[PDB]
Amino acid sequence: RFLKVKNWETDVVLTDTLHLKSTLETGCTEHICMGSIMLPTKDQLFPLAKEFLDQYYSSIKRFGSKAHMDRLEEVNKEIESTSTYQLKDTELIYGAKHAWRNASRCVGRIQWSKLQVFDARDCTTAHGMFNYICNHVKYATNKGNLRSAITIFPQRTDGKHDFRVWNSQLIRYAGYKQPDGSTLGDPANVQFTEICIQQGWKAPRGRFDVLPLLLQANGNDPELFQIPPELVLEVPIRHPKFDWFKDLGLKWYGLPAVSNMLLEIGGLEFSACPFSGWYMGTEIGVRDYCDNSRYNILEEVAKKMDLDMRKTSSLWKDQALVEINIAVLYSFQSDKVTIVDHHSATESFIKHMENEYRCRGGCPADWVWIVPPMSGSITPVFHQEMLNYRLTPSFEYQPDPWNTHVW
Amino acid sequence: RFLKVKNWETDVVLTDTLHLKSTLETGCTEHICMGSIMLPVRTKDQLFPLAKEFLDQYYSSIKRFGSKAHMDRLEEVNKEIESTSTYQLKDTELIYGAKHAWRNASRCVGRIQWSKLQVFDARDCTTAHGMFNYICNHVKYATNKGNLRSAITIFPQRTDGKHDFRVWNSQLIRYAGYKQPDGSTLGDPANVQFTEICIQQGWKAPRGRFDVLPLLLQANGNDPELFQIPPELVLEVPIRHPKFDWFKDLGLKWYGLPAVSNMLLEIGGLEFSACPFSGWYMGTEIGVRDYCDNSRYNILEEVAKKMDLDMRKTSSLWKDQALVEINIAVLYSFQSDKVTIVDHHSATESFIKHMENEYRCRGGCPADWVWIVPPMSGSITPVFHQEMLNYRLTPSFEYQPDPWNTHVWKG
Numbered sequence: 001r002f003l004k005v006k007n008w009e010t011d012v013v014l015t016d017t018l019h020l021k022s023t024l025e026t027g028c029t030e031h032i033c034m035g036s037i038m039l040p041t042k043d044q045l046f047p048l049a050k051e052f053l054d055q056y057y058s059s060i061k062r063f064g065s066k067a068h069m070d071r072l073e074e075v076n077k078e079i080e081s082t083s084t085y086q087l088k089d090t091e092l093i094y095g096a097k098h099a100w101r102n103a104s105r106c107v108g109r110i111q112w113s114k115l116q117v118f119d120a121r122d123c124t125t126a127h128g129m130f131n132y133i134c135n136h137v138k139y140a141t142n143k144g145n146l147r148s149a150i151t152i153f154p155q156r157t158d159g160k161h162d163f164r165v166w167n168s169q170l171i172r173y174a175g176y177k178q179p180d181g182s183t184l185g186d187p188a189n190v191q192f193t194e195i196c197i198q199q200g201w202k203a204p205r206g207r208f209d210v211l212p213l214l215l216q217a218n219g220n221d222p223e224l225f226q227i228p229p230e231l232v233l234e235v236p237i238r239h240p241k242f243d244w245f246k247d248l249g250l251k252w253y254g255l256p257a258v259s260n261m262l263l264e265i266g267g268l269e270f271s272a273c274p275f276s277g278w279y280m281g282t283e284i285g286v287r288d289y290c291d292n293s294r295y296n297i298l299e300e301v302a303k304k305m306d307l308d309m310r311k312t313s314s315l316w317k318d319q320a321l322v323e324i325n326i327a328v329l330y331s332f333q334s335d336k337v338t339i340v341d342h343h344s345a346t347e348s349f350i351k352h353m354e355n356e357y358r359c360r361g362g363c364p365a366d367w368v369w370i371v372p373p374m375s376g377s378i379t380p381v382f383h384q385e386m387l388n389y390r391l392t393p394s395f396e397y398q399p400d401p402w403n404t405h406v407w
Numbered sequence: 408r409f410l411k412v413k414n415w416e417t418d419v420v421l422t423d424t425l426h427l428k429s430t431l432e433t434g435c436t437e438h439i440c441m442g443s444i445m446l447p448v449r450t451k452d453q454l455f456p457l458a459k460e461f462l463d464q465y466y467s468s469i470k471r472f473g474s475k476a477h478m479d480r481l482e483e484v485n486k487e488i489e490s491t492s493t494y495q496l497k498d499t500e501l502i503y504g505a506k507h508a509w510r511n512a513s514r515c516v517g518r519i520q521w522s523k524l525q526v527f528d529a530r531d532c533t534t535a536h537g538m539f540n541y542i543c544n545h546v547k548y549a550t551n552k553g554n555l556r557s558a559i560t561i562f563p564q565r566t567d568g569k570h571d572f573r574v575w576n577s578q579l580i581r582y583a584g585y586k587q588p589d590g591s592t593l594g595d596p597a598n599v600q601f602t603e604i605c606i607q608q609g610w611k612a613p614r615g616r617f618d619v620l621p622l623l624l625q626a627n628g629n630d631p632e633l634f635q636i637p638p639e640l641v642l643e644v645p646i647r648h649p650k651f652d653w654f655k656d657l658g659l660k661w662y663g664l665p666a667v668s669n670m671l672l673e674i675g676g677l678e679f680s681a682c683p684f685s686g687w688y689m690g691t692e693i694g695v696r697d698y699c700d701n702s703r704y705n706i707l708e709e710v711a712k713k714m715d716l717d718m719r720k721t722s723s724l725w726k727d728q729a730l731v732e733i734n735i736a737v738l739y740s741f742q743s744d745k746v747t748i749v750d751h752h753s754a755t756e757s758f759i760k761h762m763e764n765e766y767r768c769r770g771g772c773p774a775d776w777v778w779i780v781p782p783m784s785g786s787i788t789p790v791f792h793q794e795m796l797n798y799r800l801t802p803s804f805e806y807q808p809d810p811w812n813t814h815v816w817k818g
């Protein structure tokens with residue numbers, strides 16, 4: 001019931017007690033592990049509110065205080081009366097920071113306590129959402145010196161007045177299915193792009209067209225907005241050695257900003273809560289550029305390097321992979337846009353894990369997501385046993401709004 | 408019940424029904440996943456249903472389920488269990504059992520080959536000298552002058568737990584590791600403890616960087632005995648690089664035969680504590696883990712220097728760059744010496760086809776993603792994008808404690 005995690009490189013053993021507080025379910029059973037699966041009322045609400053307020057008041061060293069009991073009292077009254085309740089600013093900030101702290105798939109959690117929280121609960125229309133999002137983007141981007149941020153729109157009431165950002169990220173590139181049968185742009189975004197087109201977006205059918213925001217306020221139909229081009233910081237990708245690399249015409253945006261997740265705090269659900277940090281290099285260079293179902297540029301790069309692509313055993317893919325990732329890091333650094341390499345990021349995470357075990361009794365982590373998509377075993381996280389479990393406050397997946405939306 | 412696994416690269420969805428036949432525990436609960444945890448005397452009572460479950464599987468597999476032959480065999484095993492408290496497998500059942508333990512090994516990416524396994528029945532073995540002879544024959548057969556052949560040799564099963572056969576080596580072929588008084592290590596740091604045991608048992612160590620360890624063999628619960636594998640039977644490959652000529656002067660080599668000797672084979676409730684098995688290497692086992700783990704030979708630095716990479720900041724990806732070149736060299740060297748080896752691209756592509764085939768013909772393929780995905784270039788192999796379900800089927804290979812921690816010394 002007390003669990004040990006071992007690092008097989010350093011032999012350091014940590015003891016986890018935090019998992020006992022866990023409450024949501026994993027998908028795993030005693031007979032089957034689903035560790036590699038990507039997506040495995042008033043009476044319901046008060047114990048959730050209670051659980052949360054208890055941890056909040058414990059965190060500020062005021063557990064069992066009158067202010068604690070009083071707050072629990074007031075929230076109780078408000079749920080009985082109004083069927084929901086409103087978080088104090090302090091609770092909202094604590095909860096958002098802890099949702100990130102609890103994100104078992106996130107390798108960048110050493111930064112968790114330095115999150116800028118923008119309270120957008122006063123927002124009522126899609127134009128207001130656009131304004132808050134532009135401000136978030138400008139704040140977070142900070143001319144290349146990225147700062148973590150989350151913007152939190154009004155919580156779910158009856159599920160019929162949902163605030164939703166329809167985009168999966170604030171900034172992404174369009175994808176178009178061609179008559180040539182190939183894909184132009186980002187293949188990941190074909191369906192969403194068509195939805196943008198059905199709703200009136202005039203697409204410029206290019207390879208790197210920044211998608212417009214599709215914003216839904218108060219359960220109303222979603223409206224389109226273009227993010228001011230001057231607020232989307234992008235980086236042309238060049239290589240420090242290969243002068244031909246620039247000719248590939250590659251670029252990427254500086255700000256990774258997830259906008260389709262649900263933030264749960266004290267049983268309250270924030271269905272629109274875009275959040276952003278800064279990239280780890282492999283996200284762009286390995287996944288975005290080299291995934292077969294993404295930009296898939298391995299072959300083109302390999303050819304320009306004049307590698308032997310006859311046999312897999314020449315490891316031409318691996319060679320081209322490293323160089324593409326070299327170019328990404330070099331390009332961001334050269335343009336002074338915050339980025340972290342997978343070595344630095346994973347080393348940071350090991351330190352964070354040890355900090356969390358020491359000061360919290362554990363750290364939920366999903367090894368399948370934490371180990372980077374290249375060079376896994378030369379990073380310290382590969383050798384690190386991790387326990388995965390779900391704590392609240394949490395970021396959760398939610399269904400795409402177009403499958404949900406009653407137009 | 409049905410479980411679906413999706414491939415996120417191809418959107419191919421597979422349906423698992425085989426997990427219903429799962430018996431053993433995973434370590435996970437509905438509250439916690441232990442998927443990344445490395446390591447998460449039997450009564451007649453528990454033994455007959457385990458025997459019966461196995462014999463039902465065997466007889467189904469040969470299309471003789473419910474036959475008089477099946478029924479007679481159940482009766483025979485039942486009577487042998489009540490008479491003698493255990494039972495003996497027929498050779499046919501042993502072979503089926505060993506092949507299925509491999510087929511069921513969720514951590515093994517090489518399972519496309521499972522039906523081609525040479526099984527050596529060593530259940531008539533009684534002494535450590537006999538074990539040595541069987542193991543030499545296995546090594547020679549499996550090596551086949553570099554045209555590697557998968558094999559397993561099966562020594563007598565556990566009886567009371569006081570007469571175990573055990574190979575004390577973790578693998579049949581491994582290099583010694585010696586801790587120096589200055590804290591540095593000569594040879595393979597993985598093998599320092601075992602090397603010290605061998606030395607204490609009387610092994611005269613050459614104390615070099617690549618000394619093949621002697622076999623330490625325990626028969627019938629007796630104290631283990633030291634044997635040196637005939638050097639002419641140990642195929643080794645000097646490592647060189649196709650473009651870089653200085654690579655050879657690193658002085659690296661490795662042996663050709665990966666042969667795990669510390670696991671326990673469970674078939675029909677019977678426990679084979681000594682069952683060395685061998686296949687051929689996937690390049691990254693040597694080039695990534697053996698050479699580049701900080702806790703093994705750890706050569707990334709020396710290599711990186713010789714390539715004149717920028718080692719001042721990790722952001723240059725010098726480690727990744729050197730890692731690739733080392734793995735090129737390993738594959739190049741084995742191929743040039745005509746020693747069987749498979750690259751991680753080939754191996755994972757084959758595994759995907761095997762897995763898809765298993766879903767169709769068997770209703771599933773238990774697989775441990777954490778172990779299946781190679782230790783370099785993960786997401787440019789197809790297994791990275793493949794959802795997998797991990798569960799435990801029998802017959803199976805299991806971990807067992809290291810013999811030096813449990814052995815009762817006779818002196």
Ligand code: HEM
Nearest residue numbers: 100103105106107108111148150275276277278279280395
């Ligand atoms: C500040 C620097 C940050 C770094 C370097 C970082 C790194 C990463 C990486 C590499 C992933 C894997 C993403 C993927 O493979 O798709 C990830 C996932 C995730 N991150 Fe972080 N992150 C950062 C900031 C944040 C912030 C500010 C939050 C929330 C406030 C956050 C919450 C999450 C969540 C919930 C996931 C899982 C997403 C999913 O399941 O799709 N991260 N992070």
Ligand code: HEM
Nearest residue numbers: 509512514515516517520557559684685686687688689804
């Ligand atoms: C024929 C070519 C084979 C290849 C290419 C192959 C490949 C691999 C690899 C790369 C691993 C991971 C090892 C590690 O990272 O430590 C592994 C594990 C394993 N293999 Fe295979 N293998 C082969 C044959 C076999 C055979 C013949 C058997 C048994 C009859 C077998 C049973 C296992 C088992 C039980 C494991 C898990 C070992 C552990 O948990 O430490 N393999 N295999």
Ligand SMILES: CNCCCc1cc(C#N)cc(CCc2cc(C)cc(N)n2)c1
Nearest residue numbers: 169256257258275276277278279280288
């Ligand atoms: C099923 N997975 C689908 C992909 C989700 C996703 C895609 C991209 C891209 N491109 C980028 C991200 C961003 C993830 C992220 C988020 C944050 C906050 C920081 C950081 N470094 N990375 C997510």
Ligand SMILES: CNCCCc1cc(C#N)cc(CCc2cc(C)cc(N)n2)c1
Nearest residue numbers: 665666667684685686687688689692697
């Ligand atoms: C906790 N893990 C410790 C290492 C286990 C192990 C180490 C080495 C080495 N060196 C080599 C192996 C061989 C594994 C293997 C076995 C077989 C049969 C084929 C194949 N390609 N690989 C295992």
Ligand SMILES: C[C@H](O)[C@H](O)[C@H]1CNc2nc(N)[nH]c(=O)c2N1
Nearest residue numbers: 036037038368369791792793794
């Ligand atoms: C099927 C498998 O779970 C899937 O490919 C996962 C593997 N690990 C990952 N890890 C991260 N960080 N991001 C991902 O999208 C994935 N995809």
Ligand SMILES: C[C@H](O)[C@H](O)[C@H]1CNc2nc(N)[nH]c(=O)c2N1
Nearest residue numbers: 382383384385443444445777778
């Ligand atoms: C902690 C983690 O489970 C451990 O480092 C695992 C990761 N995946 C692995 N995969 C293989 N094939 N072999 C290993 O030894 C490991 N080690």
Ligand SMILES: [Zn+2]
Nearest residue numbers: 028033435440
């Ligand atoms: Zn699990």
